[PDB]
C-alpha cells in the first residue's frame, strides 16, 4: 500500500466530535499523536461545551484504527492505512444492553501532516436512571478483540465487537458494536482476510487541567492470521451455524417445561432411541440438548 | 387382540427349516413349547441331513417372537400375537460382517393346537476359511435388544438388531439383522409404537442324543415404552441424522491428514474462529470434530 | 481341580430351606438338575408349609454357583467346584434398601450323586406395608454381575453384588448382597483372581401344580479375566478410594447451600485460583466438585 | 496505610541498573513518572554503557508495583505502598526455559520527592545461540497476571508469574519468575490475602534519541478479591494438590507403554473394576488417568 508510507514515524492526531444524546448536545476536541510502528496512541480530550452529559468511558471507541501495528506477514490486510491519504468513513451503531444506543459517522483522513477524526454522534432511548445517563460507569477500561471481515461487494470492511464497561456494584454494562468502513477515495484498497485487532486502553486525568477531560492511551496490534484445512472448517462453520440459527429448533427447545428437568431429558433421550438406531450424530445432537439444559 | 387368548398357557411348537449355504443344503426339525405368560421358550433341534454345514449359533435367530411376555401396559403393541391364528410372514437378511449373508422367509402360524415356524434359508458369499464355514464360533450366546417399529403403509412391522457371536480368540462376529413381518390374514392387527424385545438365550446339548442337535432356551420380554416431548426429539433425531448422513461432511473429514493430529485440530479450531463469532452451535460442531478425532 | 470332574454331564440337584421372616416361619423343597458344561440350571420349588410369606423373587439368590460355566482359560479360578465333593458353606446378608434383611447360612455339598443345598434363613425389620411383606414385587427377574474376590486369609472367597427387583409402579427395590464361601473339607481349593459371574434368570409356573411353587431357570457364566499394568490401577484404586471415603470432604460438600448453586461453584472455583497456581489435580478435584453438583 | 498518601498525584521515578550476563557487564538509567490513581507508568531507559548485551524485552519486569491501582475495597492489601516511604527490597529469580537465568536484587524507596529503583542483576548459563543472547526476541510484550501471596513469617510477600516473550518464528520464550518482597523499614505493613495484579505493557522508540533505549508504558490494576465457602475450597485445593504432587503416582504413570494406548487404558480400567465396587472417586481418578493419556 501507498498509505503505509504515511505511518512510519510519529503522526499528529486531531479529533472533532458533535454529540446529541437524549437531547443533550455537546462537543469534544481532541489532540495528540500515534506511532503505528509500535501500535501506540496517546490522546487528550477536552469537553468544549462544559461538563459531559455521558460518562467518558462510553466514547473511547468513538474517539483511529489506522494506528494499529500490523506484523510484516499481515501488512497486506491493512485496509485502514491503504485508504490514506484520502481516507475512509467509519459508521457504527452501538447497542448498550438494557439501554439506549449511539449512531455515529466519522470521516478519518489526512489534512496536511495531520490525521483528523471528524465525528457526528446521536444517542436516543437512554434511561434517565440507567448506567449511562446515571453515570454509574467506572473510570476505566478493559481489553477487547476487534473482528474484521471484508465486504468485497461494498469495497470496504465490516467490523464487530463487544465492549465491557465496569460499574461499581461489580456488574458489567455491555456495548454491542456494529461497525462499517468505506474509502472516500477512488483508488484501490486492500480487502483483508478474517483477522482481529487486540486492543488495550487505560484512562487518566491531567492534574493541570481543570476543564472536563480524558487522557486516553490505546495499544493496538493486528493478529489472528497464522491449506485445504481452510475448506473443512468453512463447513463445520455452517453446520454449527444453521444449527444455532435454525429458528424451528430454537423455538422448540425454549418451549419446554424444565422446572422438573431430569425426567424431561431422559424421556426425550429414550424417545430418540426407541428405534434404537444409534449414531454419533444423535449422541452429539442430544449433547447439544443436555448442553442447552443449563442456561 | 383375539390372538392374545391363544397364548395363555403352554403352547406346543413345531419348527421346519430347508437350507442352502454356499451350495450346502441341509434340513432341521425342531419341537418344543412356549409360555408367553412368562416369556419362555424351550426348543430342541435335530439335523435331519447328518452334520450341519454351519455353526449352530448362526441359526438361533432364524429358529417365535409371539412368545414374548408383553407387560400389561404394552399388550396393545403386541403385533405377533394379534396376527394369529392366521399367522404372519417373517423375512430377514443377515449380513455377517466381512462375510456372507442369509436370506430367509418363514411362515409362522397355527395348525390346530401347534404353532409352526416353516423356514427356507439361502446363504451366499461366505469364505471357505471364514468364521462361519470354518466353524470358529463358540457354542454360546449373548443378550440383545430387538428394536421394533411400525410400518403403517405395509400393515406390518419393520425390525432391526445386531447379534454378537463369540469366537475363540476373544473377537466378535457381528450379524446385522434386517427383518420384516406381514400378516397372512385379512383381519385387523395391532400396529405398535416404537419398543423393543429384551432377549436372553442359552445353548446346550442333550446327553442322550447322538444326532447333530441344539437345545435352545429363550427368554423374551417387551419393553421401552414408559406428550409434546415426542415432537421435540423427532427433530433432534433428524438434526443428528442429516448430520451423520451428510455425505459432503463425512467425506471431508475422512479426507484429512491426522498422523500429526494435534496441529490439525487447533488450526481448524482457530480458522473457525477467525471471524470470532462464537455460538454454541460451533462449540458443538467442533466437539463433533474433536469427537471424530478418535476412531 | 478334582472337583471339576464331578460336574461334566447333568447332575441331579436337591434343595432344602427353613425360614423365619418377622416371626413367619416356612419351608421350601426344590428339585432339579444342573449342567456346568453349558452353565445351565433348572429348578422347581414347592412351598411345603402352605403359602409363602414373602414374594418368590426375594428367594431366587438364596435358592448353586458351582454350575457356572467357566471358560477354559478361567477353569483354575473356579472355587466352587474345587471344594467338592466335600463342599462349602455360603453365608449371606441381604439388605433390602429402606427395609428388612435376610441372614442366611447354607451348606452345599454332594450326598452321593445328588448336589444338595441346605438352607436356614432369618429375616427381621421388615415393614408390614413394605415392598416384601406387602407383596409388591413383580414375578420376574433381571440380570446381574456377581463379583468374586479371594480371601486368602480365610481360605475362601468374598462375594458381593446388588439385585434389582421390579415393582409394579415402575420403581426398583435394591437388594445389597454380602456373601462369603468357605470349604468344609481340609483338601486344597482354588483361590481366584478377581472375576465375575454373569447371571440371567426367568421365573415361571407349572400349570399342573396347585401348591405354591416357582420354576427357576438360571444361566451363569464366569468372565472378567482377559502385567505391571496391574500395579498401576491398584494405586488409582486407592486414590479414588481414599477420596470417596474421606469423611472430612464428604461432610464438607454435603454441608453447602445449593438452592442457588451457580454462584456457589464459581466463587469456590475462583477461591481455589486466587493464588493462581493451576495444575491438573485441581482441574480434576474441581471437576469432582462440579460433578457432585448434580445428585 | 500512611504510604497511601504518597501516591496520590503524579510521582517522579528514577531507575538505576548494574547488570552482568555471561560476563557481559552493562548499565541502565531510567527516568519518568507514575500515576497510581489510574495505575499508570511511563518510563524511559537509556543504555549508559553503549549497546545492550541482552534484548530490551527481557528487562521490562526488572525495571514498580507500588504504582498499581488498588480498588477501594482492596486498598488494605497494598503491601507495596504501605512499606513507603522507607521502602522494600525486591528479590527475583528468572528462569528462561531451555536457557539461562537472571538473579536480581532491587531496593525501591523514596529519595525526597522521587521514587527510585536500584537494581543489581546477574545472568549465567545462557546459550550463545539462544533466544536471549542471539537476540531473537520481538520488540513487544504481552499481558500477565502477577499472583501475590503473603509470607506472614517473613513479614513480606511471595510473588510468582510466567512471562511469555514472542519470537519471530511464532514460538514463545517462557520466563518463570519467582519474586520476594521485604520492608527495609521497621514500621508495620499490610500483609495481603491472595490476589493478583493484571499487567499490560507496550514497548516503543523515541525518534529523537540515538543511544540504545526503550520507551516503556505499563498499565497495572489489582484484582482477584471479590464466607464458609472459603474453608471448602481450601480442602479441594489440597486434595488436587497432594494428588498432582504425589511423586509415587506421577512416576507410576510416566512409567507406562503408551504407543499402543487404547488397550492400556481399557485393561487398567477393567482391572480397577474387577472387584466391581464402583464409586465416583474411581470414575474421577480414572478420568484423571484418561486425562493424562494426552500430553
UniProtKB/Swiss-Prot annotation, chains A, B, C, D:
Ligase is among the record's keywords: no
Mutation effect (residue 163 to V): In P9; increases fluorescence at 475 nm excitation. In R10-3; matures to the red-emitting state with excitation and emission maxima at 555 and 585 nm, respectively
Ribonucleoprotein found in the keyword field: no
Expression sites by tissue: Photocytes.
Variant or mutagenesis effect after changing residue 144 to D: In Cerulean; leads to improved quantum yield, a higher extinction coefficient and is 2.5-fold brighter than ECFP
Biotech / industrial applications: Green fluorescent protein has been engineered to produce a vast number of variously colored mutants, fusion proteins, and biosensors. Further generation of mutants led to more stable proteins (at 37 degrees Celsius for example) with brighter fluorescence and longer fluorescence lifetimes.
InterPro entries registered for this protein in UniProt: GFP, GFP-related, Green_fluorescent_prot
Consequence of substituting residue 45 to L: In mut3.3; shifts fluorescence lifetime from 3.03 to 1.88 ns. In R10-3; matures to the red-emitting state with excitation and emission maxima at 555 and 585 nm, respectively
Documented effect of changing residue 76 to R: In Azurite; shifts the excitation and emission spectra to shorter wavelengths and increases quantum yields compared to BFP
Gene3D superfamilies: Green fluorescent protein
Effect of residue 99 to E: In mut1.27; shifts fluorescence lifetime from 3.03 to 2.85 ns
Family named by the database record: Belongs to the GFP family.
Subunit structure and binding partners: Monomer.
Name of the protein in question: Green fluorescent protein
Originating gene: GFP
